[PDB]
Symmetry: C3
Subunit: 298 residues, 3 copies
């Protein structure tokens, strides 16, 4: 009515006409394999519910009007197996990238970041950066019989010959939850560990600016919502005791939105089975702040 | 026993003998009409439950003894319809005001602020100020067939010929939740928008002091508890992702209590159906801090 | 596997070989007597569940490796009555103390602090300090017929002829929840009240350093988890509206761990019946930070 919100930006009767394309990845098998609580497969549905409801397109507090932006919802990736789902996701994200549009993928388990990253490495050969905003490092080895999971995505991206580890940042990781062997693996690959305490000392936005300085061009902004403290964000498989505040997350997403080198974003681990109302709202508000930032891109 | 609390201040065998009169407004129809989650009609009952239990009358941390104050509970406004409830509420609040006592009204939906404001405009003709502490602006148009709701109260107060909009402050409003047309309406009426980010930058108490400077004499302190972050205050119809902390709310209520130009207060949107224990406790602690501040008035 | 955590430190096939001994006190009768919500008797079980799961032994964010430490779980104190449970607890804690090891007692209600303190007063005659980290003072009188409870433990320790009250600190107590008569009793005994607002002004670690300066040698670090804000720590009998953050608690426990004069610790009021997942995790992370600090002791 007299209060236009995100829903209103879905004007693009055709996908190729949209600045931003939302893709859903409703799988949590990766999570279960990594010993996590099931439920993240309901993330895309919960995200969509509040997507229809939240976020003033013209925000007079930040003074950003996102009216001119065109969003499109490409629906969910559908497949018979997780492994087939990954392939279709990678293929889909690539095509959006290839024609210069911005894919935003709502999961679902963090395993989605492997295919998403692969789509990046193909769209921008030898020139990709990646930041993982996560309380965890997610460079865990695969299952004994080779199966991937919510904890392996950045092991398989660091194993990519075309990817420079100097351009990988683990952001807001927590020492109480990250093993020395996994930190060692990241650092040995020249990756950067920006611990939660360091982010908090610098300020989250300032720290993220530093991170983006390291990631450089063609950055994949990968956000695991279990990097947020569970007081603000309880609805995840691995709820954090300490972590980023909702405001820090909003501010970070806004920065990512305005940063022209950020070429795609995913958001993983939203788990409506754990908490179904407050948390999906935070997730949608995070995307909302990204949208506002993106609205300021030249 | 050896630990006197708020309950003990209810010594006034007669209402006219009390410094502060609590009035309950157990209605949430306004909320439902504004598309909100039902439940706020249980606010007064939940507030009363903890009112019997909380708040040391002599607080050695703040060094304020509220022993001398007399409180009285006038019970709930009872009526057959919301619209009749409003009239009785306005009439009741006026009489408390007219004899120089302080009415505190616990709701219930924020629609109560319309009658409460009217009672103010009558008690202090042409000389009223009003602050709305709210994540939302609440200047929404009425329903298509004229019905009021939890989102219209300040549209109907700004429409009052005796009220100066230069003396209206929307405090801790959130740009992600406030439409440009509603901000426009407030500003066009010379009202003041103090966004959450501005309150946080200044500090909540300092910002509230600034607000009171603008509201001036005969201020109505209207508090929508959905201005608090839902980590602290989950039990409301529209839970906030970001917002005021419990401590900021306590500090603000204490300031309002000590500020002699603050002539009445209401508290709206408490919803025990959403969360029944933590949230009513916060509401009672907010009133408690107001009481302590009031105890320091000359 | 390739990620060793607290569980791995339980190598000591014999108790006397451990640096730190965990003792469980699964009783909440003290709580119920003090008018509290039952459930804290499940604390030790919930604490143990996450003890098996959390806390990287080598923490690269703090740069502390706790690999060298040996922990042992002595199980629960078992008895037919609360009063017999207290005696066995005191006896057990004393023996651990007497041979120079560190007892950590997970409750259970805060009444455990009476026997724990007595074990201290015996192990270090006339030379004990005590800090109570608690939103409440816990110097309440016994029941009319003499029965103790979760609110009396520090009344019975201040009544100890061998204990100097100048070396007792009530840390992070809240004026809204502490009666003037109880504050009076503490101060009259030369005890120190460090209100939450003062702790927050100074910073929690700095304030705790000050407290330890007052407690001196042979300090008993007694932590009531209801000193934490219920946004972070909801699973307690008396949830706090405001209070210490999880991070402040972690930081405080780390300091206690590294402070050589801290000779034992207890943790009380964890109530899985109120909230069963987030809160026990916080409790285990608190112990985890203590362990890390202890790992740095000369
Ligand atoms: Mn994670
Ligand atoms: Mn992850
Ligand atoms: Mn509101
Ligand atoms: Mn409102
Ligand atoms: Mn306590
Ligand atoms: Mn206690």
């Amino acid at each position: 009515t007299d209060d236009p919100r995100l829903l209103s930006l879905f004007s693009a009767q055709r996908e190729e006409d949209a600045d931003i394309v939302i893709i859903g990845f409703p799988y949590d098998e990766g999570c279960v394999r990594n010993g996590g609580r099931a439920g993240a497969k309901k993330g895309p549905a919960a995200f969509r519910f509040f997507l229809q409801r939240l976020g003033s397109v013209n925000n007079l507090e930040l003074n950003v009007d996102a009216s001119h932006l065109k969003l499109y919802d490409a629906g969910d990736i559908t497949a018979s197996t997780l492994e087939e789902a990954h392939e279709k996701l990678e293929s889909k994200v690539f095509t959006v990238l290839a024609r210069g549009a911005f894919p935003f993928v709502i999961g679902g388990g963090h395993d989605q970041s492997a295919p998403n990253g692969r789509a990046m490495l193909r769209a921008f050969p030898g020139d990709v950066g990646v930041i993982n905003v996560d309380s965890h490092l997610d460079v865990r080895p695969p299952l004994s019989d080779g199966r991937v999971h919510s904890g392996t995505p950045f092991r398989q991206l660091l194993e990519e010959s075309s990817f420079s580890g100097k351009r990988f940042v683990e952001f807001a990781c927590q020492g109480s939850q990250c093993g020395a062997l996994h930190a060692q693996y990241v650092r040995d690959h020249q990756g950067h560990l920006m611990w939660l305490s360091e982010v908090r000392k610098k300020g989250a936005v300032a720290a993220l600016e530093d991170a983006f300085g390291l990631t450089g061009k063609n950055t994949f902004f990968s956000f695991d919502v279990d990097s947020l403290k569970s007081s603000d964000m309880p609805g995840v498989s691995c709820p954090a005791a300490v972590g980023l505040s909702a405001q820090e997350a909003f501010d970070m997403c806004f920065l990512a939105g305005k940063t022209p080198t950020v070429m795609m974003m995913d958001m993983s681990e939203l788990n409506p089975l754990v908490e179904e109302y407050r948390s999906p709202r935070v997730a949608v508000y995070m995307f909302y702040h990204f949208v506002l930032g993106f609205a300021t891109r030249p």
